[PDB]
Amino acid sequence: PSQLLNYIDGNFVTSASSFANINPVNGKLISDVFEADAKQVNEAVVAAQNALKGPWGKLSVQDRAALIHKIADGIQARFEEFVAAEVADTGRPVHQARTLDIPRAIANFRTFADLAKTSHTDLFEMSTSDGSGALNYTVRKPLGVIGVISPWDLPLLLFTWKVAPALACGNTVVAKPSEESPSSATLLAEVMHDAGVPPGVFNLIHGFGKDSAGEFLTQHPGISALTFTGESKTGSTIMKAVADGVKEVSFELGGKNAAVVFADADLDAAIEGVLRSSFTNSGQVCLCSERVYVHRSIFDEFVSGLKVEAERLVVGYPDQDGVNMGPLISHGHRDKVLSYYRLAVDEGATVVTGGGVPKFNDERDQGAYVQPTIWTGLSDKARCVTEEIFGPVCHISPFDDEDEVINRVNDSNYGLACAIWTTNLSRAHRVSRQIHVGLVWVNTWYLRDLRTPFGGVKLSGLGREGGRFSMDFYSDIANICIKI
Amino acid sequence: SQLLNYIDGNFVTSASSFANINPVNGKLISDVFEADAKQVNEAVVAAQNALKGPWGKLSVQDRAALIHKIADGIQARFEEFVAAEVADTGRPVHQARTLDIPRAIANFRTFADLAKTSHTDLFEMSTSDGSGALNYTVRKPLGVIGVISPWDLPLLLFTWKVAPALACGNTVVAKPSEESPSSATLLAEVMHDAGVPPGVFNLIHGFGKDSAGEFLTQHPGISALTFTGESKTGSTIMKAVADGVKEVSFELGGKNAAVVFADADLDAAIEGVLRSSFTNSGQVCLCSERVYVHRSIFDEFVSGLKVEAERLVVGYPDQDGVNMGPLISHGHRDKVLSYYRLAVDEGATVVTGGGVPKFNDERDQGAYVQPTIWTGLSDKARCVTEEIFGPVCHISPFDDEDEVINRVNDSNYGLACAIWTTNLSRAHRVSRQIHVGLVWVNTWYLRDLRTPFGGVKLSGLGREGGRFSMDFYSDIANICIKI
Amino acid sequence: SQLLNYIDGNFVTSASSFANINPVNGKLISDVFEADAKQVNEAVVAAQNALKGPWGKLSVQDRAALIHKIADGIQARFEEFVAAEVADTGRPVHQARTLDIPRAIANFRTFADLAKTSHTDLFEMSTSDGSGALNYTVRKPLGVIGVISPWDLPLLLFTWKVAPALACGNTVVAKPSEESPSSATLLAEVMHDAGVPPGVFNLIHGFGKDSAGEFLTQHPGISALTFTGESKTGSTIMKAVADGVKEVSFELGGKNAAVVFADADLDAAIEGVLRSSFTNSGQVCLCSERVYVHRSIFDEFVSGLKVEAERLVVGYPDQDGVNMGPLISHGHRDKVLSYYRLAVDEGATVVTGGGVPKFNDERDQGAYVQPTIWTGLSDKARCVTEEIFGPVCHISPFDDEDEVINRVNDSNYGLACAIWTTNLSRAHRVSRQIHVGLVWVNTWYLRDLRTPFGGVKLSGLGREGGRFSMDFYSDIANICIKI
Amino acid sequence: SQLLNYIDGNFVTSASSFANINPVNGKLISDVFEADAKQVNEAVVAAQNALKGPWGKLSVQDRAALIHKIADGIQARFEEFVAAEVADTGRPVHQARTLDIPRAIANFRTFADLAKTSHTDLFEMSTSDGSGALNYTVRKPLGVIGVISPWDLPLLLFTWKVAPALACGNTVVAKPSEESPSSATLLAEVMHDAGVPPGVFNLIHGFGKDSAGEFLTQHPGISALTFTGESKTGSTIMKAVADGVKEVSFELGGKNAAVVFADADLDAAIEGVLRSSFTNSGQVCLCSERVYVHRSIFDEFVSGLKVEAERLVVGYPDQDGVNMGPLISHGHRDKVLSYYRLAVDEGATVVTGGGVPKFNDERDQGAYVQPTIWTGLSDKARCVTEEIFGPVCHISPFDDEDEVINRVNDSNYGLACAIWTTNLSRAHRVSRQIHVGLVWVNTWYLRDLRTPFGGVKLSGLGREGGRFSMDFYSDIANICIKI
C-alpha cells in the first residue's frame, strides 16, 4: 500500500532497501518504508550544512518564527490526516491522538517559535586596570546541523519536541524517526515542503539503529549535535559514537517510575490517577508508573479499587466507543512484555488482574494486545520491580514511613519521574523536593508546560530541554568581550 | 618533601610515589603518592556519604560562609601558595602573585556569592478542570563531582571547577595534573583547617590512563565528570562515562587566531599579540599561535613583534624583570622542539627563536625554550593547524575581511579569538562571525566569572561560568502541583 | 463624520461634541462626542466588573490568542487605519503605511507573545526548625488601567499602552488625544468585532482639564494611570492620583541632542540628523532639537544639512515624494511660530526656514511651517533649552569629548540622544555617559519592543518595554509557604 | 547624650534641638539637632558632588567590599547598636539581638552580594540594510537618593533602603524618624570610621512637615525619594516630588488579616496569631489587626489566644521572660487608647486587656498598654478598618472560603496576609486570591531579601527587594548600536 520515502535536500527519495510498517491492531501491512543508507545520510548532512549558508541563514528571527508558525498551520490544516497516521502506526485510541498527540506536536512548533521571538541574551560590564573598562556580551547563534533520533511511544510529539526548537534556533536538521512509527514524520516532511521550507533545512531519513541510518547519523562528522530520546543502553552507545567529535549531546532515556499514595490522599482520585499513569498508551510511555507504593493503612482498599477500575478498561479498536487501551507497538514488543509477565510469576508475584492476552474472536487476535496487569507480593529487589517493562503493568507495595518510602523510590538506577498523592500542604513540598528524579507531579500525572526544564537523572538522562534550556542547547552561546 | 592524598578527612600515603620536578633546573622537589583504584573508590564512597552528613544539612548561607572561609584560608597562606605554584611550573613570581593565586581565591568568593543570590522559576498553568496547576523548579546538589584538571593554570583551573561544585552543595573527588600537584595539596590543608567535613573534598594524585584519572572516570559512584585538558583525552573520558550517562562538561584544546586589521592601534596590537603568544611561555589554552595581519601593516607588525619578543627576559621566577619561565617539563619541551623542527621542514622562515637558550647555569638542566615567530607557512601546514602549546606564533598576511574570517574558522578547534580594530561596525560585524566561544576585541585574557565560558567543535562541550555553572553543578528538578 | 465613545460593549454618543480638524486644509473631518464625568464613571465601573467576567476566566493562552485576533482585525482593515491616522494628523501616507500602522499591530503581537512566554520566580529558604520555606511570586492583573495618550504618534503610542495592559489581563479605560481620535475609534470597532467582552476595553473621548482626561485621573476605581505627554501634564497627573497612591508610568517631554564627532561618516550623519530633526515635522518626542558638531566639520555639516533640508518636500500626505506634512493644529503652529520669533530675538542666525511656506492653495488654511535650522545661540537660550516640538534644530560646534558630554547632559530633560562616530571605543565610552534613557549610535528611531524604554529627570519616571511592561501592568504578589 | 547630623563627612549641630524620650520610663535619652533648610541643601549638594568623586570611580567589586566593611563595622559594635535600638524603642533586648540588628547587617551584605552578581541584557535586531543592530542595557547610579524612614523597626527599615541605594552606586541623604534617631546616628559613625567618602552618606535629623523631611522631598537636587510610613504621608510626598517627576517607592500602611481555616493546626495558628498580633506591641506594619476564624473552631481559638495573651510578660527590655515592651511614645499611646475607647463605644466585647498595666515603678511614667483582643464588631466598624498600630486584634468568625476571601479583600489597604490551613489545594487556591503584596501560609514575618516586597492599593506603590531594588536604585539605560 502506502510508501514512505526519505526527504533529502528538498526532494523525496527512495532507497535500495525497504521495510514493513505494520498495524499492531491486526498485523496488517500499512506501508513500505525506504531505509536510507550511509550514502544518503551523507547527502542529508551535507545538504543541511549548505542550507545554513543559504536563504535559511539570512532569515531574521521574526521571519524564521513566522515560517515555523506556517509549519504548525500546515499540520493543523491536515489535522485528521496526522491523526490517522499516528493511529495507524501505533494503534493508539483516536481520542488520545486528537487531544494529546497531534495538538501537542503543533504546540511544540508554536511555542518554540514564540520563545525564539522573545529570547535575548546577556550584558556584563567590567572594570579594568586602566579605568576604561570593558563590555562583555553574549549572543545565540545556530549550533549547526542537529541530528535528531526519536522513539515510537509518542511519535510526532517527541519528534517535534526536538525538531521545533532546533529550527527555532536557526539550525538545520537531519531526523530519524523510529522504524515502528514512520508515518507522521513523513507527513511532517510534506508539510515542510508545502510551507516553502528551503531545501536541506529539514531532512528525513528512515531506518533502524545499528548498521542503519541511526548509527550512520551518529557517526557523521558533519553534525554539531545529537539529540536523542530512547532506551538508556542506546543513549550510552550514541554517547560513545559521538565522543571523537565531541558533539553536543542531549539524552532523554528510560525510567522505572514510582507513584506514591499517602494515607491522607484523596483515594478515589489517587486510584484514577495511578490507573491513568499505569495504563495510558497501554503503559508504553516513558513517564508511566510501573512501581506503586501505598500506605499500609489504605493498601488493601487501594488495590481493590484499582482492580475494579482496571477491569472496566476497554481494550480494543482505536475508534471503538469508550476505548481506553489499544495494542502494544508490535508482536516483538509483546513477546518481551509477556516474558516479563512470566518472570513476575516465577519471582512469586500475586497476579491481582490481567497477566495474559485478551481473546477477541476477530482480527484483533492477529494484533499485539495484552491485558492491563497488576502485581503484588514482589520484593524491592525483584527484576519486575527494577527493570523497565514498557507495558500496561504496575506492582503495588505497602509502606509505613515517609523517609522509608522516599528511600525506596530513590533506590533505583533510573530517575525520570514520580507522582505523589497527598492532600497535605507540607507533605507535598517536603516529600517532592526529596525525590531523586527530573519531574515530580503532586495529585496529577502527565501535565507538561513547554516552558519548564525537562530531563532525567542517573540513567534516565543527561542535560535539560524545555524553555530557556532548549534555547541554550540548540544554540552556540558566544561571548564577545570589547575592551573600551 | 611529600605530597599526600586527602581522603575522607585524612592525608594518606599510597603504595607508589612519583617525582615532582622543578622545570627551572630539573631538580626534584617532592615525591607524590599515586592513588590506586581502591583509594579512588574510598574517595568516591566518602564523597557519597558526606552528602548525607552535616554538609548536606547546611543552609545555602552557611555553606557560602564556609566557602568564603576557604578563600580566607588561602589568603592567610598566600605566599605559600605562590611558592607552591612557582615551584611546580617555574612561572614568574610576579605572575603568580597577581594572576594565579588571587584568581583562585576569587573563584571561591564568586561562586559562593552566586550560590547565595541564585533562585529558580515559577510557572503557572491552566487545566481543563479550571483549577490550574503550579510548576516550580529547584536546584539540588548533583551528587559527587569528579574533577580532572590540567597543568597550565594549576590552582586557577582546579578551583574553577571545585568552587562551583562545592557552592552547589556537591562533594568532590579531584585529581590535579601529575605535573602540578603542590597547590592542590595545599588547598586540601586549607580545607581541613577550615573545618570542611570529611569526604566533602577529596584529593587524589596520579596520572591519566591506568591511574587515578582513569579510575575516577570509571567509577559509577560519581554523578558528573568535569574536565579540562586535551581534546583526545576529552573523547576518552566521554566514552568512559557513557555506560553511566554521567553529566559531562569539557573545556578542550584550541588553535586560536589573532587578527590585526589595518585600522588597529598598531603598537597596542603588537603588545597584545606579544602577550597572547608568549604569556606562560605560550602554555595557555587561550594563547594565539596563528596571527593574521593585514598586508598594509604586515611587515611593520612582524618587525615590531620581533623586537619586543627579543626584549623578553627568559629566566628565574624571582629574576628581576623576568617575563617567561620554562616549559612545564622536559617531555613537553621535546614535543615543542619537535614542532620547532617540523616548522622548518615545512618551509617556515624563523623570524626569531626556534631553539633553546644557553644559560650556562642550572637552567640548562631545566626545560626552557625560546619565544619563536614563524612566517611563510600555508594554512594547511601542520604547525599552523595542530596545537603546539609553546611560546610560538605563525604570522601571515590577509587582504579581505571575509577571507580572514574563513581562514580563522577553517579549523577543527574553536576556543577563542582576538581581533584588533578601531572601527565600530567592523568590531561587532566580524566578532559575531568567528566560530569560537570567546572573542576579545582590542585585548586578550579578560575573564569575568559571571560569563558563560566554553568552546565549540573539538574545543569542548557545554558551558560553565555564572548561572551555567550553577546549572551544571546542580540537579534541576521540576515539581508540578495540581490545584 | 462622527466618532462615538465605546463603553461596556456599546458605541455611545454624548451631550456635547467637538471638532476634529484636518491640519492639511483646515477642513472639518468629524464630530467627536466628548465623554462627561458620568460616562467616565460608567466606563471605569464597566472595566471593574469585566475583571469578574469571562475575561477574567481566560487562560493566558486564550487571552493571547484573542489579542492576536485584535491584531488580525487591524490588519484586515489596514488602509482604513492608514486613512484615519493621515486625516487627523496630515502625516505622509508612506510613513503611516510603513511605520504607524504596522508598529501598532506589532505592539499587540509582541505583548501577546511576551505574555505567553513570561514566568515568575521561586526562592527557597532555610528556617530555624530546619524544615524550610517556599517563596514563589505570581503576576496578577493590576486592575483597571487608565490610559491617556498624545497626538504625535496616535495609534502607535495608544497601542503601546493598551496592548501590554490587555496582555497582562487588565481591563482598560483609554482616552486618546483630542487632536487625533480617529484611529483609536477604529480600534474600538476592531475590538468589538473581534469579540472582546464588554467592559474590557473602553474608549472615552475628550480633553484634559475639566474633561474626560481629568475625570479618568480622579476616579478612585482605577488601579493605575499610564501616561505619555508634556512633562507639566505628568506632574499634574501625579498630584491627581497621589491620594489614591495609584501606580503611575510617565513618558514625558525631551530636548534631545544629536552629537557628531570628527570621525563620523559625515554624509550618513547629515542624513541622520535630517531625519531626527524633521520626521513628522519635528513632532516626535524622540526628535533632535539640539545638535552638536565637531568644530573641524561644523561648516561642512551645516552647509550639507541646509541643502538637504531645502530639498524636503512639504505638502499633501499622498503628494509625490512628500517628506513633511503640517503641524497637528493651528494652536500648535501659533506656539511653534512664537518660538521661531523668540530665536531671532535671542540672536539666532536662521540658516533656513524660520517661517510658513506659501502654497497659494487650500493648504494655506492648514497648519504648515518650514523646516528650520538655527546657529549662533548660547547654551542658555530658551530656544536651546525648551521643547519646541516643531521641525527645528539648533546646531553648535564643540572641540572636546568631555565638554560636549557635559553640554548634552546640562538639561532638565533626559529622553534620548544620538551619537555619530565610526570609532569603536568612542561609541561605547561616550554613550554610557549620556544621562538619558536611550542612546542611538549611527542611527535614529530604532525600537525593539523587548527593550526597556523611558526617560530620566523631567523626561519621565519608570520604564516600559519587555519585562518592564509585564511587571508594571501586573500585581507582583509573593506567596510564602512554611513547610 | 547628643545626636548630631552627618553632612559632607562631618558631624554637625543645628540651631534647634529636640528631645528623644525613653518610652520605658519617660526619661530623656538625648537631644537631637534638627536640620534646617540650609543644612538639607548642603547635604544634597554634597551627595551630588560625591557622585563625581572617588565613590563614583569605584569598581562594583570594590564598592561591594566597602559595603561589607560597613556591615563589619556594625558587627564590631553589635552591642552598642542593640542598646541604641532598645533605648529609643523599649523593645526586648533578645529581639533586638536576634532580629533587629542581625537583619540590618544582612541588608548591607545581601545587597552588596546582589550588586556583584547583577548584570543586564543584550538584544540583537535585524534592519532594512541587513547589517543589523545591537541593543544593550546598563545600570547606572540613579543619583541622589532621599530616604525617609519610620520608627517601626528603626535600623532595619533604614538600612533596607540605604544598603541597596549604596550598592547601586548612589549617594544618600537620609532622614530617620524623630522617634528613633539613635541607631542611625551610630551608623553614620560606622560609615565615617569605614572611610566612606564625604557626601556619600548624609544623615539629617528632624520631623516631616516644615522640617528636614519636607525639605528633603522639596529639594530639586535629588533623583528619587524612597519612603516607608503612613499612607497619608505617602500621598503628601508624592505631591511634593511631582513637579520634579522624581522616582518614588512607597511602602505605606496596612490593616492586615489573618485567616484560620477549620483544617489548620490550631495550636500553631494560635501561636502564630499571637506573634502576628503582639510582636513589638503590635507596632509592625506586618501585624494582623483583624483575624477571621472558621466558625467551627472560633470559640476554642479565642480561648487559647486569650490564655496565651495573658501569659505575655510586659515590662523591661532586659527583664527575664519579657515578651512586650511599651509603645514608642505617649502621643502614640493617646492615639491607641483612643481606639481602645472607640472600640467599646462601637460595641466590642473585650476578651482581654483594653487598658494600661500598673507597675508601681518608673514604668508607670513610660508608655505601656495591654495586649488587647476584641470580638463582636462588624466589618464596617472603624476599629476593624482603620490601622491602629498597637498590640490589638479583632477576631471574627466566617463560614465560606469565598466569603472570607471577599472580607479580607474588602479594604483600602493590601499589604500582607497570613493564612492557616493544612490543605494543599486550599493553601495555593486561597493565597493567589488575596489582594496583597505578601501572603504567608502557616507562618508570619518570614522575609527573604531576594523577593519582591510591597503593597497594593493604599499600602504602597512599586516593589523593592532582589532585582527590584537593583532596578529602582539604578538608571536603566538603553544603548543601540547600528552595525
Ligand SMILES: NC(=O)c1ccc[n+]([C@@H]2O[C@H](COP(=O)([O-])OP(=O)(O)OC[C@H]3O[C@@H](n4cnc5c(N)ncnc54)[C@H](O)[C@@H]3O)[C@@H](O)[C@H]2O)c1
Ligand atoms: N578549553 C580550556 O578552557 C582549557 C583550559 C586549559 C587547558 N586546556 C587544554 O588542556 C591541555 C592542557 O594540558 P594537559 O596536558 O594537562 O592535558 P591532558 O589531557 O594531557 O591532561 C589533563 C588531565 O587529564 C588527566 N588524564 C590524562 N589522560 C587521562 C585519561 N585517559 N583518563 C582520565 N584522565 C586522564 C591528566 O592526568 C590530567 O590531570 C591543552 O590542550 C589545553 O589547550 C583547555
Ligand SMILES: NC(=O)c1ccc[n+]([C@@H]2O[C@H](COP(=O)([O-])OP(=O)(O)OC[C@H]3O[C@@H](n4cnc5c(N)ncnc54)[C@H](O)[C@@H]3O)[C@@H](O)[C@H]2O)c1
Ligand atoms: N509598608 C511597609 O513595609 C511599612 C513598614 C513599616 C511601617 N509602615 C507604616 O509606617 C507607619 C508608621 O510609621 P510612622 O508613624 O513613622 O509614619 P509617618 O508617615 O508618620 O512618618 C514616617 C516618616 O515620614 C516623615 N514625614 C512625616 N511627614 C512628612 C512630610 N510631610 N514630608 C516628608 N516627610 C514626612 C517622618 O518624619 C518620618 O520620618 C504605619 O502606617 C506603618 O504601617 C509601613
